[PDB]
Design an enzyme around this catalytic site. Structure first.
Site, mmCIF file in Angstrom:
data_model
loop_
_atom_site.group_PDB
_atom_site.id
_atom_site.type_symbol
_atom_site.label_atom_id
_atom_site.label_comp_id
_atom_site.label_asym_id
_atom_site.label_seq_id
_atom_site.Cartn_x
_atom_site.Cartn_y
_atom_site.Cartn_z
ATOM 1 C CG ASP A 234 -1.995 -0.956 1.271
ATOM 2 O OD1 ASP A 234 -3.018 -0.687 0.607
ATOM 3 O OD2 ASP A 234 -1.822 -1.997 1.927
ATOM 4 C CG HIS B 94 -8.024 2.321 1.362
ATOM 5 N ND1 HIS B 94 -7.289 2.201 0.205
ATOM 6 C CD2 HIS B 94 -7.672 1.296 2.156
ATOM 7 C CE1 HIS B 94 -6.525 1.111 0.340
ATOM 8 N NE2 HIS B 94 -6.735 0.540 1.498
ATOM 9 C CD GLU C 205 -5.131 -9.204 -3.042
ATOM 10 O OE1 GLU C 205 -5.939 -9.092 -2.115
ATOM 11 O OE2 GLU C 205 -4.508 -8.221 -3.553
ATOM 12 C CG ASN C 206 -4.064 -15.466 0.738
ATOM 13 O OD1 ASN C 206 -3.269 -14.851 0.007
ATOM 14 N ND2 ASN C 206 -3.896 -15.545 2.038
ATOM 15 C CB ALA C 207 -10.296 -14.235 1.340
ATOM 16 C CG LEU C 208 -10.084 -15.313 5.497
ATOM 17 C CD1 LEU C 208 -11.119 -16.264 6.088
ATOM 18 C CD2 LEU C 208 -10.122 -14.031 6.331
ATOM 19 C CG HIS D 250 -17.345 -15.740 0.531
ATOM 20 N ND1 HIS D 250 -17.781 -16.315 1.686
ATOM 21 C CD2 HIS D 250 -16.252 -15.081 0.977
ATOM 22 C CE1 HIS D 250 -17.041 -16.135 2.704
ATOM 23 N NE2 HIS D 250 -16.101 -15.317 2.297
ATOM 24 C CE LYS E 138 -8.884 -8.111 -3.602
ATOM 25 N NZ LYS E 138 -8.842 -7.749 -2.140
ATOM 26 N NE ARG F 220 -1.235 -7.904 5.374
ATOM 27 C CZ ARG F 220 -1.512 -6.900 4.530
ATOM 28 N NH1 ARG F 220 -0.515 -6.167 4.084
ATOM 29 N NH2 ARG F 220 -2.759 -6.624 4.149
#
Length: 493
Positions: free
Chosen positions: A51, A91, A378-381, A298, A293, A418
């Site tokens: 970011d 943001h 990306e992976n969400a979690l 879901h 993005k 991450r």
């Protein structure tokens, strides 16, 4: 074949820790980051994502940018042999109870917000969300003479100029343009700070005076001036059947409901299109790609009302494709659709959430490929396990490896959430290294992306504008591409 396998390579990126540059515009721990980045390099990772926080850079005042700490960061990434995905992060970071990295948008903007509370997304009850400027003020010249889009444009131009050496050297592979909360092109329909808990349907965020007036004008033009914004959609933690709006035969399927949902979702299409116009201008001729993005909503995907997608601003139903119009919009900007939930399986979600991440991923990726755009994700979690990585790898190449050339279907890249100490622990990192290898189709890390047909060429001008009616032709439902039930390149054998 080694070359045919190389044409199957999907690059892997790793998100940096939050706050690597802190709220005071200090790169706090270069030595610690260096050690981590060198581990990623040895692991075969292609690059990293960070970011570039508006609230850090333009904090002093309008057009008072300080790029120095981020230059030091980029310099280190370059030294460690990694490329960079730079997010134009317009943001707020953090701000919830417990959050360690707290980076509000610039205080000079918040000061204007104290005088004009309608610069913020607002729900029906009137709560102002200070994490991002409403789409309603995109073209309102209320920020010391600038519009919100002009702020974003100026910021991107300044980045392009001040980072011109890194850009010309090829350090930056893509510019991800932040377009909302968490950088995502959506409304802030599920805020923790207002009490939302998964799997609440969320709430519509169109009650700021600008959006309200725009809606009222639109309904008047439609011959129904009396129509009001939804008043029967319930609250953040409701279930769809508890609401007038989302129950079967409810307001969402009436003429009024359909009009509202079209209006509401259209604002996001135009938001993204207009801000990407500025990104193409800012980065014209640079060897970078543009990206956005799209959020992965879901929960409630498996019921006909798709309520959480709808409150987020994705007007996606079983008979109306709410994502393929986004892909079509991206096409004129030559831009990448960066998605999420790549690691998730439906069976991992509670039954009561009516959650369909696998089918949602299939829909979104298929729509991008149908529209002949690049799709990343990306992976969400956070996940460190083989189940997760195998699902990512499946989504990255849903019909497997092509032994005889490039795969007919492949994602353009995956960014892993991450970098942390946990990732780098021995076992977790060992499985991560297997993930990278399989993403790379069993090939060693390939420093020159031209070899796997990801050459970087100068960014071209946006193609001509696509009218909204043509964007919405992409709402026509399509069959997804077929998916394998499991990848042919699992991290184990």
């Amino acid at each position: 074949s080694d070359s045919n396998m190389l044409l199957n390579y999907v690059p892997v990126y790793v998100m940096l820790p939050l706050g690597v540059v802190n709220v005071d515009n200090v790169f706090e721990d270069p030595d610690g980051l260096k050690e981590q980045l060198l581990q990623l390099r040895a692991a075969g990772v292609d690059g990293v994502m960070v970011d570039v926080w508006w609230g850090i850079i333009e904090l002093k005042g309008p057009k008072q940018y300080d790029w120095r700490a981020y230059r030091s960061l980029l310099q280190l990434v370059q030294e460690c042999g990694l490329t960079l995905q730079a997010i134009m992060s317009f943001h707020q970071c953090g701000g919830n109870v417990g959050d360690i990295v707290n980076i509000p948008i610039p205080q000079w903007v918040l000061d204007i917000g104290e005088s004009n509370h309608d610069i913020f997304y607002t729900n029906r009850s009137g709560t102002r969300n200070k994490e991002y400027l409403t789409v309603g003020v995109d073209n309102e010249p209320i920020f010391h003479g600038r519009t919100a889009i002009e702020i974003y444009s100026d910021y991107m131009k300044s980045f392009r100029e001040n980072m011109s050496d890194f850009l010309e050297s090829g350090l930056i592979i893509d510019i991800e343009v932040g377009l909302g909360p968490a950088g995502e092109l959506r409304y802030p329909s599920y805020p923790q700070s207002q009490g939302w808990e998964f799997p609440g349907i969320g709430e519509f965020q169109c009650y700021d005076k600008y959006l309200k007036a725009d809606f009222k004008a639109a309904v008047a033009r439609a011959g129904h001036p009396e129509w009001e914004l939804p008043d029967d959609a319930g609250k953040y933690n409701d279930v769809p059947e508890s609401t007038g709006f989302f129950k079967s035969n409810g307001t969402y399927v009436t003429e009024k409901g359909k009009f509202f949902l079209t209006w509401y979702s259209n604002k996001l299409l135009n938001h993204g299109d207009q801000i990407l116009d500025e990104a193409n201008k800012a980065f014209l001729g640079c060897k970078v790609k543009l990206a956005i993005k799209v959020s992965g909503i879901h929960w409630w995907y498996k019921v006909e009302n798709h309520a959480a997608e709808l409150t987020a601003g994705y007007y996606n139903l079983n008979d109306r494709d709410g994502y393929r119009p986004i892909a079509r919009m991206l096409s004129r900007h030559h831009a990448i659709l960066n998605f999420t939930c790549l690691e998730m399986r439906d069976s991992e979600q509670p039954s009561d959430a009516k959650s369909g991440p696998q089918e949602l991923v299939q829909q979104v990726l298929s729509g991008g490929w149908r529209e002949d755009i690049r799709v990343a994700g990306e992976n969400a979690l956070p996940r460190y396990d083989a189940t997760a990585y195998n699902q990512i790898i499946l989504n990255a190449r849903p019909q497997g490896v092509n032994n005889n050339g490039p795969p007919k279907l492949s994602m353009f890249g995956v960014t892993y959430l991450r970098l942390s100490d946990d990732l780098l622990q021995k076992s977790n990192f060992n499985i991560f290294k297997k993930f990278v290898l399989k993403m790379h189709a069993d090939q060693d890390y390939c420093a020159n992306p031209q070899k796997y047909n990801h050459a970087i060429t100068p960014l071209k001008p946006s193609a001509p504008k696509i009218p909204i009616e043509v964007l919405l032709e992409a709402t026509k439902p399509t069959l997804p591409f077929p998916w394998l039930p499991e990848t042919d390149m699992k991290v184990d054998g």
